[PDB]
Every structure is written in structure tokens, then in C-alpha cells.
Homo-oligomer: 340 residues x 4
Amino acid sequence: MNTMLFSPYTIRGLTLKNRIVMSPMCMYSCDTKDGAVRTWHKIHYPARAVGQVGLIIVEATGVTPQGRISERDLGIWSDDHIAGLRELVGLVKEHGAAIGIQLAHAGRKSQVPGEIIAPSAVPFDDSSPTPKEMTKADIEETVQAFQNGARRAKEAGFDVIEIHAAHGYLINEFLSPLSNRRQDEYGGSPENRYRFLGEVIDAVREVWDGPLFVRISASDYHPDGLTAKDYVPYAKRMKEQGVDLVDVSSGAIVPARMNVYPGYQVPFAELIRREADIPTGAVGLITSGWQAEEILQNGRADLVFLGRELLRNPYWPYAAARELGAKISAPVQYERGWRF
Amino acid sequence: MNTMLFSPYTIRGLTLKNRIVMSPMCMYSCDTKDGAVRTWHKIHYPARAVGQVGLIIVEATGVTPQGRISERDLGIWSDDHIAGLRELVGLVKEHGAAIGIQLAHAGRKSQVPGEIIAPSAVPFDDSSPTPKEMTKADIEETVQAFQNGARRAKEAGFDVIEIHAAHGYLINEFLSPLSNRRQDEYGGSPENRYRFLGEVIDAVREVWDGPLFVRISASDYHPDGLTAKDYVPYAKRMKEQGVDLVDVSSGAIVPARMNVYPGYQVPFAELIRREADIPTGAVGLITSGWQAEEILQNGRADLVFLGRELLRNPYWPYAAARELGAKISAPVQYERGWRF
Amino acid sequence: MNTMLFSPYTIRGLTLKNRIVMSPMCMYSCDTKDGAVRTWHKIHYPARAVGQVGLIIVEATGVTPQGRISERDLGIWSDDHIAGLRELVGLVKEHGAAIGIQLAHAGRKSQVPGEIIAPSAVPFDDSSPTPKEMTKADIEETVQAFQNGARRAKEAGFDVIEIHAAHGYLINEFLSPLSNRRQDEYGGSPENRYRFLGEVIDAVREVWDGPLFVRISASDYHPDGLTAKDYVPYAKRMKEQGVDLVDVSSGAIVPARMNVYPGYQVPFAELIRREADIPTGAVGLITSGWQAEEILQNGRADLVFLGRELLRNPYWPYAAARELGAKISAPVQYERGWRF
Amino acid sequence: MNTMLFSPYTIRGLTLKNRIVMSPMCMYSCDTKDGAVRTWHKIHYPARAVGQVGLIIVEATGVTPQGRISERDLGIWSDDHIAGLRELVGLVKEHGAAIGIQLAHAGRKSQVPGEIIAPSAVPFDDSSPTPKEMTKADIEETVQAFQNGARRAKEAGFDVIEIHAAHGYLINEFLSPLSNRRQDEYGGSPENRYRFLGEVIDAVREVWDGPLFVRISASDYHPDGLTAKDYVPYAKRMKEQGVDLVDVSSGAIVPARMNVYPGYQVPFAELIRREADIPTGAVGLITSGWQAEEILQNGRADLVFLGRELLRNPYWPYAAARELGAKISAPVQYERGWRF
Ligand SMILES: Cc1cc2nc3c(=O)[nH]c(=O)nc-3n(C[C@H](O)[C@H](O)[C@H](O)COP(=O)(O)O)c2cc1C
Ligand SMILES: Cc1cc2nc3c(=O)[nH]c(=O)nc-3n(C[C@H](O)[C@H](O)[C@H](O)COP(=O)(O)O)c2cc1C
Ligand SMILES: Cc1cc2nc3c(=O)[nH]c(=O)nc-3n(C[C@H](O)[C@H](O)[C@H](O)COP(=O)(O)O)c2cc1C
Ligand SMILES: Cc1cc2nc3c(=O)[nH]c(=O)nc-3n(C[C@H](O)[C@H](O)[C@H](O)COP(=O)(O)O)c2cc1C
């Protein structure tokens, strides 16, 4: 049974052995609170690589200390992070899986003690601290921080880099009018609201020419917020800037009610894919190979991102292969076990 | 867990208790070869009604003897067929399931001994008898047969009627230029090739004002045949004539290779749905409630047609309800067994 | 994958195509309240035959009106019941499934309005009417009713007969000292409490030489009641009298707490099987083919009785066959659907 | 839903959080060929600990170099192995799982280049090297090797120790007449054939008073070989010697045909359990919580050992808990994922 799910996919120079991607998920397991890779990560990620996941994307990694979501996040603001990250990379690549990292900045949604920054001094909600309005210098510092991150990620041996522009974090906050009330050239206009992201992408492409992903929130789920069609122009923009694939998520810019169901974000992925003629990754309640195969075969997305499902079963690819009657390469150690 | 799969759907004033539809499937179980409903059908269909299927479409029923696919098909060319059909109707509606029937004519794909008819004297393949080219009288005679069938179906107490215009059968043969080489008013142009279907729809609507489906073959899978885009104008046409929902299938006008996979015909259904602005039914390798829910929630179709799965498990709705964590009314006899 | 679950089993000369048995389950669907077979039964049972169940035991059928559990039960106290039962027999055997019937008498647990009878004038609980203490004439009259029932069952064309001596009903009430306080030849000792059952078996065998099952309640779940060990001598007794297989259930002689779990009654079945050297049927939360195969291969039982599972899925045998990678004959109509 | 599967079990002073045990499975992943713990093991085992397995038993670890099955086996013949083992122990215990190790000696089935030892100079088969007949000194050396192993295992922080007396390896070879043709006090008699094992157990108990398991092969599957009843006396013996639980497997003493099916070795486990009044572990095609729960509830074994299933899904406990409606403690990191 020849399937698309387990067919190779080539981005730039990198060739993934299948279409299965481990969606970036924070583990909050940096007990040392210095952003260092810990034992938990060294067991957590390689498990999925053994599980035959084609691409494993490391959780949101703060490019600055105040850029972290929490004090237990992975970091990459120092050359000291390279060693631990390099070790992690080796542990993953070892099993035939490609490894990526999600460069992130939590913006006004950072729960790190102290000052937090954002496009405008507007709180996420009435329970969150008011962020500092970023100055011009702040913006350029942060852009430089992202570039430094990409540099270290490449240094560590990462195959793919993703820019976290979603889930209501810093970049997302520049994108949405809900959070961006600036009146300089970084706000008050679709083009202006895109500027920050545009700079981040340029800065990264300046030190990184390998696969580049950008994760977006296709919708704010708010009458005065962004919708999928607002991200078509942005996607075409990202394509022009050398972005290889758009990881299409949604929401979290502000507290909002969201109807959730199997593949509730797939239409966002197909929309961007077809309207902007750019590869996309589908994420959101993808739990079966049957479902993943339909997503791929019907051209709704090129890569399938799994979140919670890969937390429940690190070897999901095996079960999916069984479900689809496909055959994959089991680790020699598990040959007799993965066998029918 | 509030789901769309197990939400009611009203069509023309008929309320289906859910979105699950039993796709019309030939049983070839008329041992008497007279098109009469037999014990098999009386056990086969009601079983799915007990299974809590919302709508059960009875297999292809020949409006004329030579219109049957085989001599073991159900027939409706005689008022004598009513009694048996009415009994079947009661057996099904008894459990809260709506019942439909598929009015059919095999055309050049008929395997019943004797003369077979078609738009043009062109055989389906080198293993099929060459059909007689239909005269005007033949065409009007067949249109009348479709009306007689609808009339009898109404008297039997059917809730829904579907016109079989797909799978390369008679009507499909008029629609496709691959099989229709006529140079009169019934061929040579889009509206001419549609004429036969249009007349059938009108003839039926003259005696039937209930929910009316039309099953189409969205693609001929042939370079010189029809594709989805060809059926958008047709679907709009059908909407104007009072067609309530398009049951979107594909293929079988000529021998052709099909790439089959989960939901391989869903895009056809959504295409027609959104471009023709008409309710559609998705069919083709729909096997899980998870999959079915995605199709509905994402507006790809309004009803989900199940074929093979409903032959494997007549109580599929129960399994799907469990899968989705939905709650449905079990038959009072099975309450202690269906108890989650 | 050669399995024991889907291996034939011959009992007295009757060959069952597999080891799957539909456990007798009351449907309370005799709306006419005359014990007549109704449309429900004619759809309910044959569905499992199409499902490829090897043996289908019809629900508890009252040998006398007051012997019914409720007025909506099947009856067999009249020659008028034969016609309907014979029709049901044909509907089932039509698909290669053997059909059995459970001859029953509710005793003090009868809920039909009027006088109810029992070994002693002791109510099931404080919510049940106190039974009339049976006279010798009553006992012989009831034994004759069981024979009449067997005679009619034979004429209807049944393949297997099961005597309901379990679930705290009439016969069970004679067996258990909790309900049998008689001081005549029918109580006061092990063989005396067995006497009624022994007579019923003899009466039945006088008109029936086919496969004969006896359903027992292996345990009363009461400090002063019977336990499995008490039924070993009884099972040996039954073997001597020509009983072919013991269907081993438990409980319900009085209100009692039961610890229920997968195969919670299997040990009872294996106990009887190995100590009395007699074929047994295992029943009670048997839900998977995996589980069923273990029961058979490990010699815990010879037949597997399914209850609730067969109400949830009439085609369970198909699912179980897939689970075990076994091959079974699909109904010719469903061949393309059951295709693995 | 309160289950036995996820109920604590206490051995000596150790308390397992559930009845789920990871059966010892060779990984052949010691690339350095020095028996050292490698990166593979450090990822392999902790994964199951994260998966909420209650007891994880490390693969067969050779107590001597020639005692290894292969050159890629884990070893424990040197104090140098302690460091790596201690690290492994920490990585496992970290997640609430108890960790054990299987002390092993491959005997005549060793595939290590060079001399191999056995009770008698008889080959496993015509494709295997002829083993050296062990002298008295050889036997005492090997017994001392086992004691040294236990010492180091305790030193490393292991919770449980298992002695590998099965699968036709050294100890098993002393047990079975098929392989043991000695005429000294170590052969020619059930008592004599047990002597080697008896000494090994004593030697271990001399430096270890924590939980002690012994894995046996209940049957040789050969007319002239051992059967389950031969191991009853041995089990009672092991109980007398302070053995806490008998891990009941079977076969592999010589090439033999073996009928395999769900729980094909459970009867061996129950036999030893009830006849010798000693806790046992059941292993062999246990793949579902439903099945595991029946094994526990019916007193067939006290602990459930999973092999291949735990290779296919390291987080099996989660799926089993779901299957049984039980609730367990998910790692905080996976809380949102293991959640319904
Ligand atoms: C525990 C957890 C942590 C997450 N952290 C991240 C993250 O760091 N970066 C990100 O892009 N998405 C994050 N998300 C979202 C997931 O990556 C995923 O896209 C989302 O949960 C939906 O995917 P799923 O339905 O397959 O779980 C997280 C989700 C979960 C449950
Ligand atoms: C045995 C069988 C008979 C069928 N007969 C008909 C038919 O009479 N009319 C029709 O429109 N489709 C017929 N089909 C196609 C089914 O309606 C259904 O669309 C097709 O099998 C694919 O759906 P599925 O993947 O859910 O099985 C038949 C299919 C099968 C397997
Ligand atoms: C609705 C229902 C009706 C039943 N009626 C009978 C009956 O008439 N005779 C009988 O022996 N057992 C009867 N039982 C018990 C079943 O035969 C079966 O042994 C029990 O439900 C447990 O089996 P299971 O776990 O496979 O469902 C009935 C059970 C149910 C759920
Ligand atoms: C790859 C593999 C390695 C094994 N190595 C060992 C071992 O080192 N020690 C042992 O006692 N059993 C070993 N066995 C047997 C397993 O521990 C297990 O008891 C057997 O495979 C049956 O269990 P299962 O059906 O759950 O897989 C091994 C089995 C497999 C498949």
C-alpha cells in the first residue's frame, strides 16, 4: 500500500523520510531556569525520532531571557546554549529523523518575572501585566536576537528553523491590530504590521539558507482581528523572502472562544497553500494516518504536524503505518516487535 | 461532546436525525428476477435503521426491465412492485430512519439478456454488447418510466428519491461526450447533453415534491471526458429545477484507472457545494466518525454517505458516536448493551 | 492465521461453523403479549446470522404464561407458537447459522400480573410478590410444559435447546437452598434440590435427542447459598442424563453484589469443564476476539457466548476475524465490503 | 473504574505503582562490545518509565564475557559497569518506575566468539558450537559471578533482581535432561538438576535481600523434556530459598515447534502460582489492558509482563488505562495531552 504519508519530502537540500512532523510543544522542563537543554529533553525528543517521525521540531526557544514564555523554557540567547543543543541534535539525527527548532519570543504573553515587551502597552488580558511599548532600538535588538538564535541553531547542527509568529506572541502581536496600536512604520497598516516579521525573516536568511518555516495564527477569532484571508498577502510576502513552508496554526492573540474538532485548522492550511502557492504544514487534532493521508492526498498541506497525539504515543508513525497498510523501517532493535 | 455528525438535518421539510447516510448499494438479491423486494432486502436495510443510520438509500432500482444492471436487481416498472416496496419502507421507517430509493437505468452497462439502449451505438468496452442508439420515442419513453418510478416510490411511502446520473449508466452516458455522439438535440453541446437529465428531473418533480437527490459522476477520468468543472454549471442547473442535494461520486463511464484513498471524492463534493451553492453528499472511503466530522465541520459536505463500512458494521453510527464521544438514542432493546 | 475461534465445533452431530455463540437475551418485544414471534425478532436474530455468528440462542421463552418474565416475552406454551418460531428458524438457518432456543420459567421472579409460583413461599426481595408454594401436581405440570416446549421447538426446526436453570429463575430456585425450603422430595438435600432439574432434563430428552445445553448459576454470591463446587456433582449428573454442554453463568438468586470484569465467569466455566469433564460455554464480558481465542486455546471453554457485544455489533465475528487475522466466509452480497 | 491493573503491588519493601512490567528484552546495542551501558539504553528504558510502566526490567546482562548471548549485550562482570548502570537506574527511577535487571548466562547458546560452557558437551543444534563440559570449579566460578553481579546491581541502585533460568540458557541447561547429561551431583536427578539454580539463588541472597525474581521455562516442548508440573517442586523450592516471584516463560532449550496465541503461557503462570503458593509474573502475547485485567482479577498471576507490545508503544500504560476507563498520573509535561 503506497501512501503519501510515508513518502519523502525535499526542502531546499533536506530530504525528510516521511510527511510526519512533531509539532513544537513547550515542556517547561528546564529546571535550571537558564534555558539549558536538560535530561528531560534528551529523552523526550529522541523517543519520537526512534518512533520514526520524519521531522522533530524543538519547542519554543526564547531568543532572549524576557522572550521566554516561562523560566523553565529552552533558551538560545547565549553561545553557552550551543553545547546542550548540539547534544540534543545528535541524539535526534541519530535515528534518521531531521531536527528543527522554533525560535520564539513570548512578547506580552511572557510569564517571566520582570519587564516584558510588546508592540503596544496593551495587556493580553486583565490578569496579565502591562507590557512595555517597544522602542525602535528594542525592535532592532529583538531582530538581532532572532538572527543570533538562527546562527547558534545552525551551529548546533539543526536542519530546519521555524520562526514563531503565532499564538499571540511577540511577532503575532505586531501582526494583529488587536495588539498592535503603534503609529510609527510598524503599525496602522497591513504592510506596516508585517514589517517586524519581514525584518526577522531577513535577519535569519542572512545567516541561514536551509529550510525555513514560519508558524502563523491564521485567525484571531475576533470581529476586529485577523482572518485567514489577511494572511494570504503575508504568505505571498514570506514566499518572496525565501520562506519555504508556512506552519499554519491559529488564535491565542487574545482570550477567545474557539470551536475545536478534527482538522479544524486544515482549511487555513489549504487556503494559504493554494492562494500563496507555498508549501504548508497542517496542525490541529490530526490523530490518525487515515486522516493524515487524506490531508496529503487532497493537497490541503504538504506536511502533517502532530501535537498531543505524539505525546500519547511517541511511536505514532508505526501505528499509522499499520492503519494504512504501509511499511516503514523499524529500528533494528524493534524489528521483531514492529513485525506482523 | 456536541457533534455535527449527530446533528439533525432538514431537507425540504424532512428531518434526518443525523448526517449519516447509507449509500445506495446493489445487493443482487432478487432471486425471482422480477425486481421484487425479497427477504434479503427486508433484513438488510432495516438492520442499518436499527443501527441508527439517519437516511437509508435503497440500491439502484431499474425503472424498466432492460434498465436493470442485472436480473437480480430491484425493479419499479410495475404497480406490482409497490406492495413489496411499501413493506420495506415500513420495516425501515419503523426505527426512525428516513428511507430513500435510487431510481436507475443501466443503459449500455446493463447486463440483462436482450437489447440494451444508450445515447449512441458505442459499447462500454470490448467485453460489452454494443447498445442500440435511442430514438426520440425511446428517450421520452424512458423519461416517462422515471416518472412512473417516482410515482410508485411516493405511493410506497419513500421519503427521498435519488436519480442515478452517475457511474457511467444511462443518464451519465448522455452527459459525457465519451459516450454521447448524438447530433440531435441530445448531443453536441453542454446543454444538449444535459437535456435528458433535465427532462428526467422535471418528469419526477411533476409527481414528486419531496427531497430529491441527484448522483453524479464528477469526473470521467479521461482526457476527452468530463471533469468537476463541467458539473458546476450542471449543478446550478439542477438547483434551478428543484434538486435539493447532489450526491457526488465519480468515474465508470469508461474503463479507467482511479487513485483511491480516504476521502478521494470529498473535493468533488465541496467543489460542487461551494460553486453551485447547493447541499452535497460526500462519498468514497468514508470510514470513521473522526473523518466524517471533519467533512461536515469544514463545510465540505452536508451529508456523509457510507458504503462498504455499513456492510461491515450495520451499527456503525454507534461506533462513530463512541469515537466522537457523542450521545445517541439506542434502540430501547439495546439500551443496556449500547451503554457506554 | 489459523485460529480456534473460527474453527468448527460438532455437538451430537450438529456442526457449528465457529465457536461464536449469541447468548440468549430478552428483547421484551412481543407487543401482542401472547408470546408470538414479532417483526422485531425476525430482524434482530437473522442480523447476527448474516454477521456469521455460528450459533444463535433465542431469548428466554416461557413454557407457560405465568412462566414468562414479562408479558412481552416469547412464549411456547401453545402449538400456535410453532408457525412464528419456524419462520424465525428459517430466517436464521438461511445464513448457515445454527439456531437454539432457551426454554425458560421465571418462577418467583416473574413480573407478569397474576399468581407466580416457586419451590417455597419466599419472595425474591421486598419488591417482589410472594410466590405460591408449588404442589406435586404443579411440579409435574411444569415438567410437562418443558417437554411440550421442547417438542414444539423441535417441530419449529431448532438445532439446539437450552434449559434455563440460572439467573435465579424457577429451576434455579429449586437448586438453591436460599429459595428452596421444601421438606419433601424436592428439598432438604443436594439430590432433592436437583430433582426438579433432573426431571426436566429427562422430560426434554424424551422428545429431543439433539444438542442440549443447560444454563446454570454457578454461584449465589451469598454465604448461605451455592458456589461453583456445588455444581460439579450436578454437572456430572447432567452429563449422565445426556446434557451436551453447560452454559456457565452466575448470580441473581437473590439481590447480591457482583464484582464484574473481563471474563469474570470464565473460571466457573473452566472449573465445571475440567472437573465434570463436560463441554462448557463461557459468558460474561467477552468482548474481543483476542480474549475469545485465549479462552478457547487454554481449554477454559469450548464455546464463547457473547451478549452485549452482539447488541453493539451484529457483525462482531467480522471484526474479531480481522483482529485475529483469521479468514471467514462473508455473505456473498458483502464480499466487496468485508474484503480485508 | 477501579482496576487491579493499576493497583499498587508490594514486594518485600518495594511498592510498584501498578502491575505493569516491562519484560527483559535484549537490545544488542552495546556497540563498544564491552557490556557498557550505551546511549541507546539510556533512551530506550526511560521512555517506558515515562510511559508509566511500574517495573522496568533491564535485558539479559551477562555475568561473564562468555556468559553473554552476543558481543553487543550489557555486561556486569566488572566494577566498571556500575557507573553506567547507576546512570541508567537514575534515568528510570526518576519517573516513578522501579527498575530491575536480569542477571544472565547464555551457556551453550552464547554466540560470543571463543569457548562457551554448559552442563554437558552437547550442542543446542547441529549449527551451534559444541560447549565445554563445566567442571566443578567452573560451576563455582559461575555461581560466584552471579553473586558479583547481584552485588554490583545493588551497588548501582537496582530495585529488583531477576535470575535468568529460562530460554535454554546456562541455568535452564542444568534444569533440563535434554541438555544436562551429567552424572555428578549436578545431574541425573530432578534434585540434582536443580542444584545449580539452588546455588545461584543462595549466592544472590547472600548479598541481596530485596525483591528477587526467577525466570523459568515451564516447558521444553519435547517428549523427553520438562513440563509445567516438573516446575511445581522447583517453585516450592525457590519459595523456600526466599524467591519472591517466579517469572514464568517457556521453551528454547532446543529447537522446537511452539503453538503461540494470546496468553499462551498464562496457564503456566497460574499453575506455578496456585500449586507452589508463590507470586508469579505472566508473559506471552499480553497486549491489552482488558486482557491484563482478566489475568489479574482471575488470580492467574500477580504481575503482567509485556514484551513486543512495549516495543510498539512505550506509553502502553496510557492506552490500557483508557481502554479500562482507569485513571493514572500522567507526567506533568504530558498532562494536557494524556487528557480527555
Ligand atoms: C503541552 C503543549 C505545549 C505546546 N507548546 C507549543 C509551542 O511551544 N510552540 C508551538 O508552536 N505550539 C505549541 N503548542 C501547540 C501544539 O504545537 C499544537 O499545534 C496544538 O496543540 C494542536 O496540535 P494537536 O491537536 O495535534 O495537539 C503546544 C501544545 C501543547 C499541548
Ligand atoms: C456492493 C456494492 C454495490 C454498489 N452499488 C451501487 C449502486 O447500486 N448505486 C450507487 O450509486 N453506488 C453503488 N456502489 C457504490 C457505493 O454507493 C459507494 O459509493 C462506493 O462503494 C464507495 O463508497 P465506500 O467507500 O463508502 O464503500 C456500490 C458499491 C458496492 C461495494
Ligand atoms: C438485554 C439483556 C437481556 C438478557 N436476557 C437474558 C435471557 O433472557 N436469558 C439469559 O440466560 N441471559 C440473559 N441476559 C444475560 C446475557 O445472556 C449475558 O450472559 C449477560 O448480558 C452477560 O454477557 P455479556 O457481558 O457478553 O453481555 C440478558 C442480558 C441482557 C443485556
Ligand atoms: C527482541 C526481543 C528480545 C528478547 N530478549 C529477552 C531477554 O533478554 N530476556 C528475557 O527474559 N526474554 C527476552 N525475550 C522474550 C521477551 O522478554 C518476552 O517474554 C517474549 O517476547 C514474549 O513476550 P511478548 O509476547 O509480550 O512480546 C526477548 C524478546 C524479544 C522480542
